[PDB]
Structure formats: C-alpha cells, structure tokens
Amino acid sequence: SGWTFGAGPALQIPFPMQMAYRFNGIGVTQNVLYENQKLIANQFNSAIG
Amino acid sequence: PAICHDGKAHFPREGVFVSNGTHWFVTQRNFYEPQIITTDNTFVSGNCDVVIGIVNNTVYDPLQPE
Numbered sequence: 001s002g003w004t005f006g007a008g009p010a011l012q013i014p015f016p017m018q019m020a021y022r023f024n025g026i027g028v029t030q031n032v033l034y035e036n037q038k039l040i041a042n043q044f045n046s047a048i049g
Numbered sequence: 050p051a052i053c054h055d056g057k058a059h060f061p062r063e064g065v066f067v068s069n070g071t072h073w074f075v076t077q078r079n080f081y082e083p084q085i086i087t088t089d090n091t092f093v094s095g096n097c098d099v100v101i102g103i104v105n106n107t108v109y110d111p112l113q114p115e
C-alpha cells in the first residue's frame with residue numbers, strides 16, 4: 001500500500017506503480033522506472049542479497 | 050502503468066490510471082476524480098515494448114475536432 005497505509009486505510013496498489021510514484025516523488029518521472037524496471041529489480045535484489 | 054494509443058506509452062503527468070471496468074480514466078492519488086485521458090494530463094515518452102502491464106485503451110486529442 002505504500003504510504004497510503006500511513007495515513008488511513010491501506011490502499012492496495014501494485015508495486016511497480018508504487019515505485020514509479022516514489023520516483024515521481026524525487027523528480028525522476030514514471031517513464032524511467034517503467035523503462036528500466038528489470039534493471040531496478042535486479043539492482044534491488046543484488047543490494048538486498 | 051501506461052496506456053498505448055499508437056505504439057507509444059502515455060504515462061499520467063499527475064495521478065494514476067484507473068478503469069471503472071471498461072473505460073479508463075486519470076484520477077488523483079488521494080481523491081477519486083475520473084477525467085477523460087487526453088494529451089494534457091498525459092505525457093508520451095517511450096516505445097511501448099519495454100513497459101510491462103501496459104493497456105492499450107485510447108487517448109482523446111482536444112485539438113483534432115477543432
């Protein structure tokens with residue numbers, strides 16, 4: 001639910017959508033995430049590993 | 050995540066894409082307000098092969114009828 005559960009009821013949203021929203025938060029726009037989603041997922045998995 | 054009108058992903062400049070089952074709209078994040086998906090509220094940047102989960106739908110040009 002992203003940040004929505006920190007305000008009221010949890011708002012079920014897809015994770016790619018939430019990540020694109022987070023990118024929009026820092027002035028990167030959604031297109032970057034939706035064009036690099038595989039790279040971002042791989043980088044996140046490598047960092048978590 | 051995006052809408053493919055003619056081989057081009059249309060992402061929403063502010064807000065998310067929603068569909069009431071059949072018709073897709075653009076609404077804000079913290080309040081449901083459906084708006085017809087035009088070129089004003091959507092910016093096109095992509096190829097429509099890389100994004101995953103893109104729906105086709107259609108966009109409305111506010112200048113073509115005029």
Ligand SMILES: *[C@@H]1O[C@H](CO)[C@@H](O[C@@H]2O[C@H](CO)[C@@H](O)[C@H](O)[C@H]2NC(C)=O)[C@H](O)[C@H]1NC(C)=O
Pocket residue numbers: 069070071072
């Ligand atoms: C989703 O909402 C749209 C409204 O934008 C519905 O389209 C119809 O739009 C006309 C406008 O001339 C209304 O008079 C109709 O009442 C709308 N239909 C309905 C059922 O309300 C569209 O039908 C809606 N989709 C669903 C599945 O309800």
Ligand SMILES: *[C@@H]1O[C@H](CO)[C@@H](O[C@@H]2O[C@H](CO)[C@@H](O)[C@H](O)[C@H]2NC(C)=O)[C@H](O)[C@H]1NC(C)=O
Pocket residue numbers: 053056104105
């Ligand atoms: C969305 O529009 C695209 C536009 O490219 C269409 O994709 C077609 O998919 C079929 C099946 O692989 C191909 O044979 C065609 O060449 C593609 N393009 C066209 C213009 O037909 C299709 O109309 C829609 N696809 C989806 C998944 O909704």
